[PDB]
């Protein structure tokens, strides 16, 4: 039942979403499995960016874990994966 | 002091600022004067000071000062207890403040309003 | 806030430069200075060092005209530091836009200086002002932004800017509606009251 979802993070309007693994169970956030990147949609220098760390994701999924479309953002972000 | 003794019964760091017990809590209380009483101060300060016992609802029936010059109505005036005792008064524990709402207003004072004088309208 | 306040009189009680009744008669005169502004309540100065030091820093706070809320903010930043807390604070303080609105010669009084920034009427190359609480950059062409452009305040200010609190560090300009804060304020050029073991000393529990 493992899930990789985007926890809408960063103070709203600017979410600085942060793609994370958690049990798809929480409607929205709740239980945390482990972090896995970010997608910051507003104005930032670094250490603060937008992360997609495509590799780890793939290990989880293999054995059955799921991913968002704002991870699809992340995935297809440079068409990084796409 | 052998460690071995000490260890057995350890010795307490925290603070140690103590004098006598004080009570309750709830930032305010819902209370009205039992009666509005009047007491002496001390002798060379040769005065008389106006007060009130006060049933609350966040513990303890307190006797309370009603200050500056003057005080509230007798009985249960609608009185506001906004805490107190005095340096010059042992062992009182919540006081009934005027120049501050419920009460009457601290009469013949206007030399303060957050405290004393008037309970001017909290802007 | 500006914090709100009345200017020549003030100059009499704190007794030092803090950069604030800018116009054409300022301090003393036509009504001196130091011959009261009270006539009852100052009648037995009940000083202590708290006093001396209070005033000491107070000057400095006022020298920049900053709210205490903010002043504090500066103090702390400096304090974290490995350094001798004090100095680094001054750079910081000085570093703000209001400070830098008078030192380029747009503002003069903090109030005025700010007044400009405040009313979206002095700019920086510094995180959208409308505020002189803003803090200016190395190269900040602290530049004029509308209804003040070499107007009265600014034009005259660009003068005394030059002589402000010698900004060797921020290139005091305001004539070109600019004022290129080249780099941060440092104790290369003072304008201080305290000493860094009077104020540093002063802060203490």
């Amino acid at each position: 039942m493992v899930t990789i979802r985007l926890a809408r993070h960063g103070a709203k309007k600017r979410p600085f979403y942060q793609v994370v693994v958690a049990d798809s169970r929480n409607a929205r956030n709740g239980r945390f499995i482990e972090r896995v990147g970010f997608f910051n949609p507003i104005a930032s220098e670094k250490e603060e960016g937008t992360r997609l760390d495509l590799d780890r994701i793939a290990h989880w999924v293999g054995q059955g874990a799921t991913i968002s479309d704002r991870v699809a953002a992340l995935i297809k972000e440079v068409n990084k994966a796409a | 002091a052998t460690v071995n003794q000490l260890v057995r019964k350890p010795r307490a760091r925290k603070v140690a600022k103590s004098n006598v017990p004080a009570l309750e809590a709830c930032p305010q209380k819902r209370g009205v004067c039992t009666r509005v009483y009047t007491t002496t101060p001390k002798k060379p300060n040769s005065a008389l000071r106006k007060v009130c016992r006060v049933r609350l609802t966040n513990g303890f029936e307190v006797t309370s000062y009603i200050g500056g010059e003057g005080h509230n109505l007798q009985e249960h005036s609608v009185i506001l207890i906004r805490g107190g005792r005095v340096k010059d008064l042992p062992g009182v524990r919540y006081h009934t403040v005027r120049g501050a709402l419920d009460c009457s207003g601290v009469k013949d004072r206007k030399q303060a309003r957050s405290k004393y004088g008037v309970k001017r309208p909290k802007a | 806030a500006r914090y709100l306040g009345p200017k020549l009189k003030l100059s009499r009680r704190e007794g030092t430069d803090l950069f604030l009744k800018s116009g054409v008669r300022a301090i003393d005169t036509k009504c001196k200075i130091e011959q009261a502004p009270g006539q009852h309540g100052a009648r037995k100065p009940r000083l202590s060092d708290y006093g001396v030091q209070l005033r000491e820093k107070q000057k400095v706070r006022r020298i920049y005209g900053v709210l205490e809320r903010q002043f504090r903010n500066y103090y702390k930043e400096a304090a974290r530091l490995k350094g001798n807390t004090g100095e680094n604070l001054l750079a910081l303080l000085e570093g703000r836009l209001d400070n830098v609105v008078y030192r380029m010669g747009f503002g003069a009084t903090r109030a005025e200086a700010r007044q400009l920034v405040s009313h979206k009427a002095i700019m920086v190359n510094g995180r959208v002002v409308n505020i002189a609480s803003y803090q200016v950059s190395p190269n900040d062409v602290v530049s004029i932004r509308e209804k003040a452009k070499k107007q009265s305040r600014v034009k005259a200010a660009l003068e005394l800017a030059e002589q402000r609190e010698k900004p060797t560090w921020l290139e005091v300009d305001a004539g070109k509606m600019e004022g290129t804060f080249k780099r941060k304020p440092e104790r290369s050029d003072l304008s201080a009251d305290i000493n860094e073991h009077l104020i540093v000393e002063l802060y203490s529990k």
């Binding site: - | - | 490995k82 350094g83 001798n84 540093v200 203490s204």
Partner: protein, 150 residues
């Protein structure tokens, strides 16, 4: 330095032939160095008369202060009676909250790289005296193996 601070003249009471009289007697610190602070106990009958008698006295013996960085060579601790005192070598470049019992004498020493704090007592009489006793002790070294090779 060359500074002196007049720590205090002191109203004492004798309690004489007739009334109960009260004096000034002065402990003052003087210092003319980090390496020299001297403090003297004067007697007398006025704030100056006292201070002077202190200063004088103080100037009598102008002695060690915060060797090494304007800071101690080594942190030192002070008793005098029951007084618990403390001073460190540091920098004043690391700051120094320049106390009284730690920028009076330190000031007339001139140095301030030494950070201090006294526990217990409010009595300078013993405590800054103990602070002084606490400052002194920071020795004469004698190598990068000083004590470790005399």
């Amino acid at each position: 330095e060359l500074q002196e601070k007049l720590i205090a003249v002191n109203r004492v009471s004798k309690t004489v032939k007739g009334g109960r009289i009260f004096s000034f007697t002065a402990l003052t610190v003087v210092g003319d160095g980090n390496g020299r602070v001297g403090f003297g106990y004067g007697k007398a009958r006025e704030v100056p008369a006292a201070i002077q008698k202190a200063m004088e006295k103080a100037r009598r013996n102008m002695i060690n202060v915060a060797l090494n960085n304007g800071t101690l060579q080594h942190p030192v601790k002070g008793v005098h009676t029951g007084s618990r005192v403390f001073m460190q070598p540091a920098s004043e470049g690391t700051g120094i909250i320049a106390g009284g019992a730690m920028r009076a004498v330190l000031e007339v020493a001139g140095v301030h790289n030494v950070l201090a704090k006294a526990y217990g007592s409010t009595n300078p009489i013993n405590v800054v005296r103990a602070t002084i006793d606490g400052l002194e002790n920071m020795n004469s070294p004698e190598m990068v193996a000083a004590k470790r090779g005399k």
